[PDB]
Amino acid sequence: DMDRFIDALMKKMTVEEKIGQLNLPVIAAKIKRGEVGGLFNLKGVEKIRDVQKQAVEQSRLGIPLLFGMDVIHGYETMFPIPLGLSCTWDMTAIEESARIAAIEASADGISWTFSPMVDISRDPRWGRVSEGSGEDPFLGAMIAEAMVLGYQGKDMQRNDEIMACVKHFALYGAGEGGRDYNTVDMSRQRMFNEYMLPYEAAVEAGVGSVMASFNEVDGVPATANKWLMTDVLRGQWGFNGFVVTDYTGISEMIDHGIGDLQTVSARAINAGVDMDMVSEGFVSTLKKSIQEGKVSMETLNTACRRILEAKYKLGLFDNPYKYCDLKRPARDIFTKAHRDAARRIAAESFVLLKNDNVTLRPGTPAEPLLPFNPKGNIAVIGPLADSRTNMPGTWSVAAVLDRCPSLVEGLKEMTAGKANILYAKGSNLISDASYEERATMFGRSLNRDNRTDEQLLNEALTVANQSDIIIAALGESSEMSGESSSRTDLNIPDVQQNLLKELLKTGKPVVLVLFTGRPLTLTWEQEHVPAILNVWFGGSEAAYAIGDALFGYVNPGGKLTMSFPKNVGQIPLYYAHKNTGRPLAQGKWFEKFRSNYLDVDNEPLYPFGYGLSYTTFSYGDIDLSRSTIDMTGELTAAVMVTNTGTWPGSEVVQLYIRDLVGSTTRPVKELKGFQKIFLEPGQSEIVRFKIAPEMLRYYNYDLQLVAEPGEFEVMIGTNSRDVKSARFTLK
């Protein structure tokens, strides 16, 4: 068993060797000296197996390395960016995507992924919303569990299972101004009720590791916050794994302004940080701090033991080359089977935001543009129409970017012999050249040239006037989101929106195929464009998935997981908000002396849980099996859902609960369940949710997790806004 093996190995180690287990650089001589616990961002089973060999046969002790990577939404087969993927509301598919990424990464030497990212954000200015699962902790928690299980399985003993790492602990999504890395501040009550659940869910799913965040919390960088890294993570949640820093998290505490490298390195290990990514703080200062009494041998031994336990649980002491089978890449990476799964999941992720009836043929009743049969001349226009490299999304560091089909390429393939795909670039990404350069970093160039926006527009209008339909492929480049990609404006960029306006003016039907890593401010587009399909960034097979949706091979069933505001001046806008003492009643905007603005109502353009279908669904009234239950009781909430349109399709039936009165103020609703159903036209299904007091608990003023007696409102519907309602009492 483990405790004896590790007891025995640690009794053999020098202090330098114990310190070395805590070092994660991004070398050959360091491994020989036992100064390396793991490496990251090394790609290829060949390079990795050879680094493992050195560790195993050329260090005094032969301790095997962990090999890490940001395997975030795929290894080479790229699934949608996590924010897009969350809109599937499909935990089975989400688990599957993680399973596949693990199969591919493990095939190539990787034993550890820095995933899932589970940070709640209510602030769409932050580029890293693309990396998460939206604004809601219940859904965030369910996804956290699905991802951990996908990567790790039961117990990481299979050679196609790897160690997951829940990040970024904690509260990194609340950075002020939506500006990445910026100050975070909130009450403890808000932390636990509104931000913490997804981290806790990952811990409770058995996640092997946790990554400490860049932000301060209560004026202490998270990487030195003992309350977080020990008292909450271990003391409250019983986490048995290890904590890694984010990239140079330790030395960045110097800039944060809490001390010199020795001081913050000591504070980090004393807080419960076990492994040091890149900074070399632990390696270069811990011996000196042990000599001065600033860090005890107990503390060092604990950190070391945790690293060794992780290696042992991965089976690395049984076999250092568990994940170095040179025959696996050919069998496991970028296979048709995997790519087909990615295409299926990508189509499932898209959110149909609008699909109004349009007058297509003179005299006929108006009908929607989507879906359409692939025939005639199909214009595909815009700076996202013919880019391979922008398809997979940000966070695709192992992807072969220029191997992904562009939208034009994929639609060409899918329509060959049936329709002509007519391309025009239409516009640059944005007017400002310098902006375009930074927005297309990391190999995402759109090959901007000397052609002016007027030139590009004119060419596009010529093409558009040759066509029967216009697919406007517009929005963000993939690197307008991700890390260090914060925006103060959330529009479709200037020249693209002008292009869109001019395309509409041709009188040809226009479908907006929107690429984005985040919520955008879309009021103009909602007013003027007949059809809006949010495709996020769908991964390496996005082009094919988009064709599937456009041509009706798949009926869109995605639902938003983050509010879409009308303007940046409404931020933060989130569905699970408090009522205030002066709530504006529905339809009363504007009212003086209510909580409202002079210039816009309080509502998002599209709420949490919003998404349309090529069919329609109708909800009957809610049946509650009980009108009252006590602290040990239960009841069932039941609703009949009917497919009332002409298309087979899926619906995400959403369960919300409002605690009407609290000892503290409670949100106007909270997601507490969901079921994704598939119905043929005319078919009905009674959807049942079990409601029990465990679900009704919340962190009160004293941070006691309790359900208080009183009345609750149960709401069920197609999104967080449009719901059927019923009430019951807890005694």
In angstroms, the CA 664 to CA 677 distance is 36
Q: According to CB under 5 A, which residues from 660 to 689 bind Mg ion?
A: 661
Residue 248 beta carbon to a second copy: minimum distance, rounded to whole angstroms = 8
- Among 241, 657, 258, smallest CA distance to 268 is for 258
The contact pattern for a second copy, residues 497-536, with x = CB under 8 A and - = no contact, is ----------------------------------------
Place of tokens 């399985």: 153
Residue 660 beta carbon to Mg ion: minimum distance, rounded to whole angstroms = 6
616 binds a second copy per the rule CB under 8 A: no
Q: According to CB under 8 A, which residues from 536 to 575 bind a second copy?
A: 567-573
Nearer to Mg ion, 432 or 708 (CB): 708
Which of a second copy, Mg ion, none interacts with 616 (beta carbon under 5 to 8 A by kind)?
none
Amino acid at 664: T
In angstroms, the CA 431 to CA 495 distance is 6
Residue 520 beta carbon to a second copy: minimum distance, rounded to whole angstroms = 13
Choosing from 123, 246, 274, 386, which is the catalytic residue?
246
Q: According to CB under 8 A, which residues from 637 to 696 bind a second copy?
A: 660-666
Among 49, 710, 713, 725, binds Mg ion (CB under 5 A): 710
Exposed, middle or buried: residue 28 (CB in 10 Å: 0-12, 13-18, 19+)? exposed
Q: Cα separations (Å) of 217 from 182, 185, 238?
A: 11, 6, 21
Q: According to CB under 8 A, which residues from 436 to 495 bind a second copy?
A: 438-439, 441, 480, 483-490
Q: Are 211 and 114 in contact (CB under 8 A)?
A: yes
Residue closest to Mg ion when measured from CB atoms: 710
Residue 626 beta carbon to Mg ion: minimum distance, rounded to whole angstroms = 17
In angstroms, the CA 319 to CA 332 distance is 20
Residue 122 beta carbon to a second copy: minimum distance, rounded to whole angstroms = 9
Nearer to Mg ion, 337 or 661 (CB): 661
- Among 364, 323, 200, smallest CA distance to 705 is for 200
The distance in angstroms from the start CA to the end CA of the chain is 49
Given strand 66-69, what is the order of strands in its sheet?
38-40, 66-69, 112-113
587 binds a second copy per the rule CB under 8 A: no
Residue 629 beta carbon to Mg ion: minimum distance, rounded to whole angstroms = 13
In angstroms, the CA 703 to CA 708 distance is 13
Residue 407 is given by DSSP the state: H
Which of a second copy, Mg ion, none interacts with 594 (beta carbon under 5 to 8 A by kind)?
a second copy
Is 600 annotated as contributing to ligand binding? no
Pick the piece of the chain touching Mg ion (CB under 5 A) from 475-483, 491-499, 657-665, 717-725. Answer: 657-665
Residue 482 beta carbon to a second copy: minimum distance, rounded to whole angstroms = 10
Is 659 annotated as contributing to ligand binding? yes
**Alpha helices, DSSP H only, in 45-136?**
45-58, 82-86, 91-107
Pick the piece of the chain touching a second copy (CB under 8 A) from 183-191, 294-302, 510-518, 607-615. Answer: 183-191
Cis status, amide bond into 565, omega within 30 of 0: no
Nearer to a second copy, 106 or 563 (CB): 563
Which of a second copy, Mg ion, none interacts with 211 (beta carbon under 5 to 8 A by kind)?
none
Which of a second copy, Mg ion, none interacts with 708 (beta carbon under 5 to 8 A by kind)?
Mg ion
- Among 467, 516, 473, smallest CA distance to 496 is for 473
Nearer to a second copy, 92 or 579 (CB): 579
Q: According to CB under 8 A, which residues from 209 to 248 bind a second copy?
A: 214-216, 218-221
Nearer to a second copy, 87 or 174 (CB): 174
Pick the piece of the chain touching Mg ion (CB under 5 A) from 316-324, 349-357, 369-377, 710-718. Answer: 710-718
Residue 440 is given by DSSP the state: T
Nearer to a second copy, 146 or 191 (CB): 191
Nearer to a second copy, 678 or 701 (CB): 701
Q: Are 550 and 535 in contact (CB under 8 A)?
A: no
Nearer to a second copy, 579 or 618 (CB): 579
Q: Which residues contact 609 (CB under 8 A, 6 or more apart)?
A: 559, 560, 561, 575, 652, 654, 671, 717, 718, 719, 720, 721
CB atoms within 10 A of CB 139: 23
Among 599, 632, 694, 704, binds a second copy (CB under 8 A): 599
CB atoms within 10 A of CB 437: 12
Q: Is-catalytic flag, 246?
A: yes
Pick the piece of the chain touching a second copy (CB under 8 A) from 107-115, 171-179, 360-368, 384-392. Answer: 171-179
Residue 666 beta carbon to Mg ion: minimum distance, rounded to whole angstroms = 7
Pick the piece of the chain touching Mg ion (CB under 5 A) from 170-178, 193-201, 264-272, 651-659. Answer: 651-659
Joined tokens for residue 291: 């000599």
Pick the piece of the chain touching a second copy (CB under 8 A) from 172-180, 362-370, 399-407, 605-613. Answer: 172-180
Listed in order, strand segments (DSSP E) in 507-559 are: 510-515, 531-536
Residue 565 φ then ψ, to 5°: -75, 160
Classify 224 as helix, strand or coil: helix
Residue 696 beta carbon to Mg ion: minimum distance, rounded to whole angstroms = 8
Count of residues near Mg ion by CB under 5 A = 4
5 binds a second copy per the rule CB under 8 A: no
Q: According to CB under 8 A, which residues from 108 to 127 bind a second copy?
A: 125, 127
Pick the piece of the chain touching Mg ion (CB under 5 A) from 236-244, 373-381, 382-390, 659-667. Answer: 659-667
In angstroms, the CA 278 to CA 655 distance is 44
Nearer to a second copy, 538 or 667 (CB): 667
Classify 382 as helix, strand or coil: coil
Residue 677 φ then ψ, to 5°: -115, 150
Reported as type and span, the H/E element at residue 252 is: helix 252-256
Q: Which residues contact 366 (CB under 8 A, 6 or more apart)?
A: 356, 357, 358, 359, 360
Q: According to CB under 8 A, which residues from 246 to 265 bind a second copy?
A: 249, 252-253, 255-259
Q: According to CB under 8 A, which residues from 689 to 728 bind a second copy?
A: 701
Which of Mg ion, a second copy, none interacts with 220 (beta carbon under 5 to 8 A by kind)?
a second copy
416 binds Mg ion per the rule CB under 5 A: no
- In DSSP notation, 274-336 reads -BEESS-HHHHHHHHHHHTTSS-HHHHHHHHHHHHHHHHHTTTTT-TTTT--TTHHHHHSS-H
Nearer to a second copy, 190 or 626 (CB): 190
Residue 657 beta carbon to Mg ion: minimum distance, rounded to whole angstroms = 11
Count of residues near a second copy by CB under 8 A = 78
Catalytic residue IDs? 246
Binding residues for Mg(2+): 659, 661
Residues that bind Mg ion (CB under 5 A): 659, 661, 708, 710
